[PDB]
Amino acid sequence: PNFSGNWKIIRSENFEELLKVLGVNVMLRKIAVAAASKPAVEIKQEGDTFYIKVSTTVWTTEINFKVGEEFEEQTVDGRPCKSLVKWESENKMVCEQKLLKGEGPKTSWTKELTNDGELILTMTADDVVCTLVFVRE
Numbered sequence: 229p230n231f232s233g234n235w236k237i238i239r240s241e242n243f244e245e246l247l248k249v250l251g252v253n254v255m256l257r258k259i260a261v262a263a264a265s266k267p268a269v270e271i272k273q274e275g276d277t278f279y280i281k282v283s284t285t286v287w288t289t290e291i292n293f294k295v296g297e298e299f300e301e302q303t304v305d306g307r308p309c310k311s312l313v314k315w316e317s318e319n320k321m322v323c324e325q326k327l328l329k330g331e332g333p334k335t336s337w338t339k340e341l342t343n344d345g346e347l348i349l350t351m352t353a354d355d356v357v358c359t360l361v362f363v364r365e
């Protein structure tokens with residue numbers, strides 16, 4: 229469907245647990261968690277080509293990809309990764325991430341627009357799954 233739109237969060241899960249697995253210490257986790265509790269997402273979709281803007285009060289991230297086409301972004305703790313997105317349904321894409329330099333936990337994300345209009349993205353580090361639920365602003 230149309231992932232395109234401006235999205236605001238309504239529900240979050242396992243986000244502090246995600247930063248724990250990535251090795252962010254406790255005081256930092258709590259602070260970052262609260263200060264990134266209301267991230268703003270903007271998506272412009274053009275077929276299989278995607279633009280995503282994720283933004284907190286002082287930070288913003290820009291992501292651009294074509295489905296099927298290898299590109300470079302960063303992990304959640306800021307590490308360089310080669311990324312590949314593929315479709316898993318009409319509503320859902322999956323991205324596998326490969327660290328450009330070095331080793332660490334297995335990272336991936338998914339993006340799913342439900343039929344009832346929720347944008348669900350999940351973020352994964354090893355066996356930990358962070359879920360963020362958004363609706364259109």
Ligand SMILES: *C/C=C(C)/C=C/C=C(C)/C=C/C1=C(C)CCCC1(C)C
Nearest residue numbers: 264267280282284289291304339349
């Ligand atoms: C298609 C939807 C995507 C690719 C969503 C990606 C989500 C992020 C890149 C999350 C970014 C965040 C920050 C930049 C600050 C910390 C809070 C996060 C994890 C939401």
